[PDB]
Symmetry: C3
Subunit: 353 residues, 3 copies
Amino acid sequence: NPYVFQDEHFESRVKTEEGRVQVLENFTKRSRLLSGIENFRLAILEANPHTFISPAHFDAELVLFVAKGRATITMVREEKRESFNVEHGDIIRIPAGTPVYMINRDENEKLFIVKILQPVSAPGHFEAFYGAGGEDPESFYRAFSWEVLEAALKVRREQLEKVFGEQSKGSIVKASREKIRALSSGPINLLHKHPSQSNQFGRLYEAHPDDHKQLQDLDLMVSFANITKGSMAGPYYNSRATKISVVVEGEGFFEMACPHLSSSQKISARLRRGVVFVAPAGHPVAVIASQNNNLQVLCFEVNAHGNSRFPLAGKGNIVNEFERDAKELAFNLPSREVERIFKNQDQAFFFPG
Amino acid sequence: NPYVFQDEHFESRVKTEEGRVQVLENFTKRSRLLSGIENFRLAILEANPHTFISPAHFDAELVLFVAKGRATITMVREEKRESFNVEHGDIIRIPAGTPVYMINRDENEKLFIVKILQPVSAPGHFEAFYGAGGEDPESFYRAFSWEVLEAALKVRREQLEKVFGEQSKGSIVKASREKIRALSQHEEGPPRIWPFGGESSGPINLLHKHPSQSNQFGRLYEAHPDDHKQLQDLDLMVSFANITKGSMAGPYYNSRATKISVVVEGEGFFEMACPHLSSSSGSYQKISARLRRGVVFVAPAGHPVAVIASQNNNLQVLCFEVNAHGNSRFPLAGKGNIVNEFERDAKELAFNLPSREVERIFKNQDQAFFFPG
Amino acid sequence: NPYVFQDEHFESRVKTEEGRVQVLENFTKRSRLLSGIENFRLAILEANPHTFISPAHFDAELVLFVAKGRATITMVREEKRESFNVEHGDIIRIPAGTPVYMINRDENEKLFIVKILQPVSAPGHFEAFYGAGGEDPESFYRAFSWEVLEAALKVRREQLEKVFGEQSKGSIVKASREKIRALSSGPINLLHKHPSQSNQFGRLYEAHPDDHKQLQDLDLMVSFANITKGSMAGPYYNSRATKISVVVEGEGFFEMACPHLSSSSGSYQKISARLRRGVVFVAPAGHPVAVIASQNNNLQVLCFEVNAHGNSRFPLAGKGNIVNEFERDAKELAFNLPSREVERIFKNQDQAFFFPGPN
Ligand SMILES: [Cu+2]
Ligand SMILES: [Cu+2]
Ligand SMILES: [Cu+2]
């Protein structure tokens, strides 16, 4: 299944006692079917309570989502140093090239953040540039000769070897109880918002780039779905956007029709927590949750401007909107004999499975 | 010829006794020379009179042009079905994912439509998503299992196996004379001024507007994305040229537009100057090709191109010009040609001849754009 | 070195005994590393005094910079014709497909022009279309049959062969005192701008697309850096722009921290090369780069910075050092050292952007 990514497709770039960062492989590596989203990479960051994430700037425009816990994200722009207080559900865009560090405020629960990066310059490949540490993460300063650093900073050579040539703990280190306290057009909370879809079978929260200028620069919509146990997300497809969905918590399963994979096309997966599945534009996809627990899934909708969700099944079903004569010629069956199939349901988007 | 595509370069994705849909191959497959229009695909739909095209949606932005016959195009859009009655020379913009169906409201004239597609995901590749059908066409509901479809629309399993197992004639099926009359009775859309321009959404009457270039030897109708809501999203200009028999569209080149020309009706030939391939700069290679109905030739930006019509009958070419904003159409011969505007002393040094030998070369054609052949 | 291009990477498309045009190869030819500037090409034009450059148009957007000499650029866009006299440090935008010829109106100085081209059709490739020429500047009219040219131009076949076959001297030809006749929005004199950064150790001129419209179409900033002898342009990185630097005059060297050529889990390869007149080096987005001038003479660098909108010059040393802005707590856990010890190494440089460096 080219449209499904489990744990074996990730690659840990950061691994410490107090934290880890997993980076998903390029979507154009396995198959060319995902020729789009080639300039998009997916990253997952988790950290222990009262820990510190070393500062670094990226070769990519960064948009992240706070999956669990609370945190303090500090961005360093031109002169101005912005610090923002975020919570579970907040969305922040980090502009490419700016330095950013963050901590885990909370005392007992962890901290999970889902990053999506659009590489500038070379597409599909991004790197983190570390300005601190000489062994644990080498400072790019160490890539310069000593004469250049001595001349630029006007500092003794042995003092440079001392400041950089220390720190071997992690790009995610632990913090003192006091240092966490001192550090604690802005962030956008997706959960604390009027749901675009509201019913007992599911709660859908989405932030479209027309509403918030933070997401307009990348033309990317972030949407979150809380599925009721046993319920399902009815079969539908996006007009123009390609859905990159990541499971935050829970189990279920999804199915999708792909005319590219057939013999002139059954595509499905089990869908557990920590699995990424890509739903391209125009592909009919349906998500069903197990009867035991919920299915909280985060979706990234690339190319969101002009998108229009078409439900294959529901109140606004795209088929029962046809003319009475067109339904007859299509199925080669009388009108009322096929008019009843799409008129039976009354719910919206979310259904029970 | 790297710029000429004939019948062997088309794929018949739809094959029915009442019509066919030939889809052109990707411009990259043969060579990387046409890499500028890699994310574009071509299609040609033919249909017998009084027929029905099954509803479907595409993973690509679609802009179709009616090159022969009349039809009724209906789109469902966002909770508001709209239908349009279009005839010869109408441009229709179908948003990506928007389902669409159409008929051939004529009694004896077959349909003939040219489609240009712009994929929104994987570049250069697209597929049609038929929602209704069993075998031909195949509905994507059959990819979902019976257990999921059961709890989707409150319908039993054995009741679904009867609906999705009936249609098998094809995507272009015959229709009774009243079903054609029902759809073609009323067109659904907000009031618009006529002829339909680009100030509001809906079809565009390309042949109902004054030509940008017009004389005895030919006429050129065009729709630029700058003043067209339907085309501005694509930065694609649609042009049509009715070259008189024995006449020619004189040598010219686009400043930044890449022309994807499709011959609708007539016979002729075209010549183009290409420095990119030239057998290693030995000399310009005379890229000539015979032109008939069904031949598609592409002229990349900056390339001088001339289209000559046969002496027998006119040559009528449909032009898809990608990257149209800021595009200037520079003529190399005739009235207002570009080489004439050079300073006199610059022509003496460029050609290495005195002014008496070169000046009246670009000053001795009273006509503009269209000339005798 | 994937980021450095010597004279062996250029290909001369024009070569006459009065001038030549060396065209840099594709940035994506050797490796897929410089994919961010795949749709950009570089070219250098040198011309003897009192010479003429044959007219032509390109299937590419053209932004040229005059590095040395006097000249005048003549363009013929929509019907009307414009002719601008340009000198040292002028920026001229040329729309794709608009013909352009020029001359070196100086009587002694050679005309040196640095071109950057953005192909408007097939990415990474372009060609020059000569209309008024003969054999060596081969006119594209020769690609059409004489029956077509005769009907469209209304000119006899014998005269067409006589005109489109005479010229064989090349694209750059000497012109004898007809210069005065061929020289009698708009250019941007970069050197006549106030430097964005200026001290004793260097001056930085720049023309951002947000302030000039002409560049706004390419999202391309043109920058110049006159670094004093022995001095250096301190380690910095562009937030978004990919810099394509060309050494106009002088000697020196540059260093860059590239984590893509690391060949390790999370390292930074040391990219370095000597700088001399004609060397082109590319500093991708986010890459810390430092340029150092030779101790004898100055080092003058012209920079084409693709993707300039929203770009910021983050300096890693000097007055506006980015690391100094960090909070004292953040400085400690990052270095695993006391906050008081790490501050001394980033506050010890008083100068901005330009510093000395001799060892
Ligand atoms: Cu597919
Ligand atoms: Cu060519
Ligand atoms: Cu690198």
